[PDB]
């Protein structure tokens, strides 16, 4: 269980009361935005959570450099295989944690991503579970 807490994900705005209409169940647990591996959406397809996948709500956006340190913060540290980024649903980067426990305030810079309105993906893959956390970041690089 974890999230992205800057840029703030989707799930951390609504935690935070940043968003202007009301999320719901997420608001209280921002931290469990759990599904299986595999997916390419911002709640994962945990039915419970779908509305962070309503591109039709006024999510904020944070505007930010090319270069950009990204950081979670985990309640329950689980072993991980990889951090993966997505760019609008492509992959960018990946980090291996090579099966090992990460720290439970961890940062990551990703580079190189282009400028303008795009949404970022995060996707936290558990080494020893079928399941992956999900957060889609909105920002505006220049
Ligand atoms: O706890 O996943
Ligand atoms: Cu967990």
């Given at each position: 269980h974890g999230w992205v807490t800057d840029p703030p994900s989707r799930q951390a705005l609504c935690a935070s009361g940043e968003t202007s209409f009301d999320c719901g169940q997420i608001s209280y647990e921002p931290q469990s935005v759990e599904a299986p591996k595999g997916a390419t959406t911002c709640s994962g397809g945990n039915e419970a959570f779908?509305?962070?996948?309503?591109?039709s709500k006024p999510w904020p956006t944070t505007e930010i450099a090319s270069t950009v340190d990204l950081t979670w913060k985990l309640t329950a540290p689980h072993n991980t295989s990889t951090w993966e980024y997505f760019v609008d649903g492509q992959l960018h980067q990946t980090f291996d944690q090579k099966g090992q426990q990460p720290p439970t305030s961890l940062t990551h810079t990703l580079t190189d991503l282009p400028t303008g309105e795009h949404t970022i993906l995060a996707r936290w893959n558990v080494s020893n579970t079928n399941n992956a956390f999900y957060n889609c970041m909105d920002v505006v690089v220049s």
């Open positions: 779908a509305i962070l996948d309503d591109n």
